[PDB]
Design a protein around this ligand. Structure first.
Ligand SMILES: [Mg+2]
Lengths: 18, 130, 130, 24
């Protein structure tokens, strides 16, 4: 569903999703 | 060790997530949270453009600011996993703005150095409170 | 803004509790957590003697070190309530040492400036790992 | 048994407490 990146390194709030 | 960690020495950074959430809620300012690693070249390249971008540096004054080299305990801050660099926004209502996403479909909160204009737009989106 | 906040500029302070727990577990060093407030004159009086006590400054290097101006989300760090200054110890098994207390029955983890000897002895207690 | 008022009140771990005894 869109462009991708590989430029990452892998390791009481509400949330609003897209 | 300074809180800035090279992201913006003139900015007022907060030490802990707990304190940042308190500041956001009590000041009605959105919280911007930058996850990074010292050993990550992607983190370092983004840091460089972030620190040098005058628009970002100025707009950042309207936020509570947190940068982390270690993940919080809040799973809402990693809706598509734990990777760096990752910039998350939290609304003063203490609702994580998981709807403020960057360019990439596979890493929804990652930014690359060329994505500063989109970051600015997303900071402005954060300032339109829920 | 530095992490030391006047408690020991030559020591290595950790930024967040979550990271401090990780560093304690992996280094097998116990964690000492100092809770204080800038506006608290008692915090300031204890900070002064802590900073300048050579024995404490030396022994502190055997700990993961955290000082906070805002409470964590861990209720184990306030067995008898939330006040400052307050010094808690955590074992690297990630067990809070609620059994390592200061002189006062009413505020079990408070220390006054005259209590450096007991503080030192408690640090030694915390180094006897579970 | 001393008490202190040299404080300001604030507005995944286990915990270890001392071993127990019968109250006087
Ligand atoms: Mg007083």
């Amino acid at each position: 569903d869109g462009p991708t990146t590989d430029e990452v390194t892998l390791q009481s709030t509400a949330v609003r999703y897209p | 060790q300074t809180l800035s960690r090279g992201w913006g020495d003139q900015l007022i950074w907060t030490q802990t997530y707990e304190e940042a959430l308190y500041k956001s809620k009590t000041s009605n300012k959105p919280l911007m949270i930058i996850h990074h690693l010292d050993e990550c070249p992607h983190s370092q390249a983004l840091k460089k453009v972030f620190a040098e971008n005058k628009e970002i540096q100025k707009l950042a004054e309207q936020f509570v600011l947190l940068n982390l080299v270690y993940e919080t305990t809040d799973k809402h801050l990693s809706p598509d996993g734990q990777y760096v660099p990752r910039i998350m926004f939290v609304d003063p209502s203490l609702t994580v703005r998981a709807d403020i996403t960057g360019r990439y479909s596979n890493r929804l909160y990652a930014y690359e150095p060329a994505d500063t204009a989109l970051l600015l737009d997303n900071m402005k989106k954060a300032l339109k409170l829920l």
